[PDB]
């Protein structure tokens, strides 16, 4: 991968986020998703890569754009691409917290080619966190005890994040019984997982079941930021098992570590759509100095150098014109 | 009011927030409320005021502490006090957004003496916003057209905030049908209303029905920040109408403007408990330079001077002990 | 001291900074100093203390004089004062100009004459007494500081003032491998920077005013760190001042506890941008109109609580700026 | 110019800034300059451009690297390049304020090919400022009266920045006489001119004489941020006139508008070396999640889009190792 594509990825997530923000709070999940997909595809085809979508909007039969296997880019180094044009379509439609646009790139085969199934996840931040600090087969209590010891705090200081779902009741109960503080997000476990390794997020541990593509994207970010994560694909019927087999996955109970989900040279980029526990959302700003503009907040990182860049971008815009001029 | 009480009010809201934070994500709404009430009462009794609670936890037969009429303070200038020890008890218990501790002070009779009933609210920020820019008897569409013209933006740029409740469905649809973006909060319409006059909140208008004491608190802050707000009390049974009558209110459909809710010299102080659209919440911080500490984020403001102060406070704490050492 | 006075102090420094700022870059050192003094005295007299100025603008010509009684009535406090640390700074619009107030219980501050003072300072709550000492070599001081901070010598940033009298310090610190950065003026800011987050300054070594050293020590006692100071006597009459104040060990080395002891409150507000605080700025907004923004810090040694205050003060900049004077 | 080169320019300025920072406060302006030159040339040759140095380190007879005319880059779109490996070598050697590293790119002929001579400069920020607001032949007083009118402030509110030099005494005296506030910098009139269009700089106007290539670099930035500037080359001896003639300039008293200094599509990038009135300098940071790193603060901007990006970058480093490891 050319060093240039890292910083080019942030332009993609910025344009996707502005498109999504034009649909924020319009109550149309589909329109928000479509605005993001359009902008991200358009932006991607200007990046100097020979890219193949390995995680994206879905299979070609269900997704006309950014489908698994689609070729993207203007030509260049060959890369596998893990996309989320809009992480949080419902989030964005309701103006909720933790909506992001996400783009990750790897050398060929770098990402777990994961099906659209659920995935158990446990994640903690810290560059010094050793392999095995978290393990899905151990109890919540033991994982949290090891994490508290590694961070040098009493159990009661720990903030565990999980999604507000019935499937997480037991997690929430056990964590709380062993003394930790457990906070709940409505949607957005990409942001929720990455927040374990984000400065001043207030979140120490993520534990929960969510989308498998979302789990891989989070693992790419954690590979760059430092931390440990374990994941395990869940299968509820024969159709899901068939998706797995179609993507080359046959060990259905495998526990994946970070290196199994995203390996080698990884670039991760994200932009906030709404305010979240990882990134701030797009905002309209006035000024006589430069006129009105939209502000976006992004992060781009790469696993080889561990360099992390936080980017605040000012995009000229006349808010007397309709906001949907931010689309494509 | 002596100028000193303004800055002493932030110490009160800070201690209340740290006590509340020790209960964040513990799933105990009652214990979070009680930690906040205890810390706020203890800190209030060290403020050099002759204070009378006019907005508080409730009536004495239902609230043992910080009840309507309670005398508080170490002695000094006479003030009416509007309190919210924890705005967002459920929020705090679940670690959701927009939880605050709030303390406002006025000269005697400065706050609307309303019963604890629902209140229709409409609020916009801006020092130059004229009286009448918002009116509860006009349609959502006409209010929003006037706001869009005053702010100099297309209707689609406006971000209207309201709570995610069935009672707001009509508002949601109409705003969206006229072209605006409408974002939903799960709770905390104090922060929701104050966000309209808060820099970089990304919220332009609040329209919703919520608690009347919360409406008064938000109006006090807006009196200091600059903005317009109209309220109308709602009565759902004969006992609530009786409450109004015993307090001297017979015009049940009265539209209160910002000056009717909070008049004269007003001091307003608030500290974040969780991250919200007005203030950031408490965080645990490490440093070799000063050791570990909790950071609080507060605001204090005064209507006479319009001076606004944003306070970031570092409170030393050894997080090897239990977090509940932050309780008073 | 009541907890109330801590937060009242910051209002004092903010008002002094706004009045100083009205005179920033006007090339009138005297007018700056007078605007600052007027604002600070008027604000101090509304604070509920029986205050006594023990360190201030020492010559009456330069009205917050040694021994003056200030305050509206309350607990007895000694007041260590600088209405404007950097009169020349503010008048030139140079870096590191501050307004500063420290308070202690009676006798808490060193009673030092208006003489020069050798200083060495480092930040860090865990730094032990003896990490810095004015009789050890610059080299050995820096070796201990590098070890304490866990960095290579070459990473250390030493701050001193750009004066001939610091040539030897500068040479030796660079000889041993450290980076040495120079400030035009403002060794209050320069010393406190050693314990300020993101200042980029690890150590201060230099000679400056004794009052400024006491003020910096008061802040370091709240922020965490170590400092040593020694008074310098060039004239017979400076020695006589010292004798008049009960000092006969002229070569005494003062640790921080000797400079500022007991319960200490320290407050400062930036006038110009510097290595500890940001300076006052003019801001526009449709939302609240125009305002001046001040950046302040207030801290207390007993609790170690530190508050950073960003304050927005309404102002019509179509009117002359000197309406910010008291 | 491809959109990718904009964000690639920042990597160049960041690497030059890190290398300069390793020499900060070492009292060796030659060594600081050489570290910056080496790092900038090595980073530039990885940028996908066909570049020609029009403003650089010097003429080939005096500068072996980054000399006027040198071809640089890895190959790509053709660009003229205006370089300052280290703006403020003496600054950086003393750890003084306002040192920057600077890289700007334009379409061919975009920059004034300026000789190494002094240049009178006057500059003001603001997208609405009209050509003629500043003019070197009007008095300081009349320039300042127009700028006060344009900004809507009393003359006493204005802050004029200039360098502390004898040649500027008349400026300083007249500006103070007409009522403005005049703040002085020891060095760094690239930063000082750009500060006029930087948010919260506190600097309204820059007036003074400095390096001509520095004037062109600042003009490039102002063309992206919005502002007006006028410049005039001045000549002290025959050698300096010859420097002008060698570059095709015989109209020695020409006044250059901002469009004469930098025109067309311009990308401008800069990174702080030391804290200054436009950018913060490099800092050493410790973290209990990421380890130690150096933080750089950069900006990159483009005149066609007016997009401005503020970039905070975290560069992994073990500070137990010698700081000279930042020289690449
Ligand atoms: Mn998606
Ligand atoms: Mn409450
Ligand atoms: Mn002084
Ligand atoms: Mn240079």
From TrEMBL, chains A, B, D:
GO biological process annotation, one example: gluconeogenesis
Binding site for Mn(2+) 1: 33, 57
Cofactor names: Mn(2+)
Pfam families noted in UniProt: FBPase_glpX
The keyword Manganese is assigned to this record: yes
Binding site for substrate: 87-89, 118, 165-167, 187-189, 211
A GO MF label: manganese ion binding
Keywords carried by this UniProt record: Carbohydrate metabolism, Hydrolase, Manganese, Metal-binding
NCBIfam families reported for this sequence: glpX
Protein name in UniProt: Fructose-1,6-bisphosphatase
Taxonomic source organism: Francisella tularensis
């Amino acid at each position: 991968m050319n060093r240039k594509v890292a910083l080019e990825a942030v332009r993609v997530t910025e344009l996707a986020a502005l498109a999504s923000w034009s649909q924020m709070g319009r109550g149309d999940k589909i329109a928000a998703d479509q605005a993001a997909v359009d902008a991200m595809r358009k932006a991607l085809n200007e990046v100097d890569i020979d890219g193949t979508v390995v995680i994206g909007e879905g299979e070609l039969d269900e997704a006309p754009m950014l489908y698994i296997g689609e070729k993207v880019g203007a030509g260049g180094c060959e890369v596998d691409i893990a996309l989320d044009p809009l992480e949080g379509t419902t989030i964005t439609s309701k103006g909720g917290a933790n909506a992001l646009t996400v783009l990750a790139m790897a050398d060929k085969g770098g990402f777990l080619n994961a099906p659209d199934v659920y995935m158990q996840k446990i994640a903690v931040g810290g560059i010094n966190a050793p392999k095995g600090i978290v393990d899905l087969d151990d109890s919540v209590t033991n994982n949290l005890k090891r994490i508290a010891e590694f961070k040098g705090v009493h159990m009661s200081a720990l903030v565990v994040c999980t999604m507000d779902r019935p499937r997480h009741e037991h997690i929430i109960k056990e964590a709380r019984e062993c003394g930790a503080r457990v906070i709940l997000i409505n949607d957005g476990d990409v942001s929720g997982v990455i927040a374990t390794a984000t400065e001043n997020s207030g979140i120490d541990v993520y534990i929960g079941t969510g989308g498998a593509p979302e789990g891989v994207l989070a693992a790419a970010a954690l590979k760059c930021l430092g931390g440990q994560m374990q994941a395990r694909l869940i299968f509820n019927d024969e159709e899901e098992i068939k998706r797995a087999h179609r993507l080359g996955i046959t060990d259905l109970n495998k526990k994946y570590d970070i290196d199994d989900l995203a390996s080698g040279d990884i670039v991760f980029a994200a932009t906030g759509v709404t305010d979240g526990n990882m990134l701030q959302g797009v905002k309209r700003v006035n000024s006589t100095r430069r006129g009105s503009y939209a502000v976006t907040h992004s992060v781009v990182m790469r696993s080889t150098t561990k360099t992390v860049r936080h980017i605040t971008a000012e995009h000229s815009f006349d808010f007397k014109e309709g906001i949907e001029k931010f689309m494509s």
